[PDB]
Structure 1
């Protein structure tokens, strides 16, 4: 069992992928989103790559990302509306930033992360 560990994840894989997706999506919707510390760390890694194909561009890159988030509206909104703007940059198309505040009863430290303008 455990030692040298790569890609830090919680819940259960099906859930995880579930989240990564949903949030990846909601964000693509709002540019900037609010969640808990790692929610962000990772959502960063994933939405990072995702927008990377968004830009990647073409019938394929597209087909892939839809394979993923299942919805044209966005599909496109993304792939052709912002993706480009980024497309020339260099990965890390996102900004993960911690806030000074915790969710209730728990103290969960959270923050916001968004398409990186």
Structure 2
């Protein structure tokens, strides 16, 4: 009875699911756009969206929080110095998700890309 609860499990337990959310956030900040399944994407969306808007603050605390997920010092710099100032005048919603007409093959999963906006 899922009533009013909202999260997702993705057939992964808590530890794993978390890591997944990072390694995807990670890669998303790295390459700008990535392509995963429609559900992972739908969820992942807000995770990066949260980190972006955290960077947008700028302070050391903010930097000391985003680092807790991204772990990597350089990708943190990359976040704060280029990505975030792109968005100082767009509040909320820093990423988009779009569905892909071609499916997967050996499991026929649906596919979607997640690029951040400009």
Check whether TM > 0.5.
yes
Residues 78-87 or 4-13, more deviating? 4-13
- Aligned counterpart, 1:2: 3
Moved more, 21-30 or 102-111: 102-111
Deviates more, 1:10-19 or 1:34-43: 10-19
> Over aligned residue pairs, what C-alpha RMSD do you find?
1.8
* Structure 1 residues 4 and 74, CA gap change in structure 2 (3 angstroms): closer
| SS of residue paired to 1:11 | coil
How many pairs are equivalent?
117
Q: Note the alpha carbon deviations across 1:16-65, whole angstroms, 9 max, x for none.
A: 11011011011101111111001100110111111111212111110100
Are the aligned partners of 1:101 and 1:107 in contact in 2 as well (CA < 8 Å)?
A: no
Q: How does 1:3-22 map to 2 (within 5 A)?
A: 4-6=5-7, 9-22=10-23
2:58 and 2:66 map into 1 onto residues whose CA distance is 10
Call closer, same or farther: CA 1:106–1:7 in 2, change over 3 Å. closer
CA contact (8 A) 1:28 1:78 kept: yes
For the residue of structure 2 that corresponds to 1:113, the secondary structure is strand
CA contact (8 A) 1:56 1:87 kept: no
How many angstroms apart in 2 are the aligned matches of 1:69 and 1:6?
21
For structure 1, the residue ranges without an aligned partner over 5 or more in a row are none
Unaligned runs of 5+ in 2: none
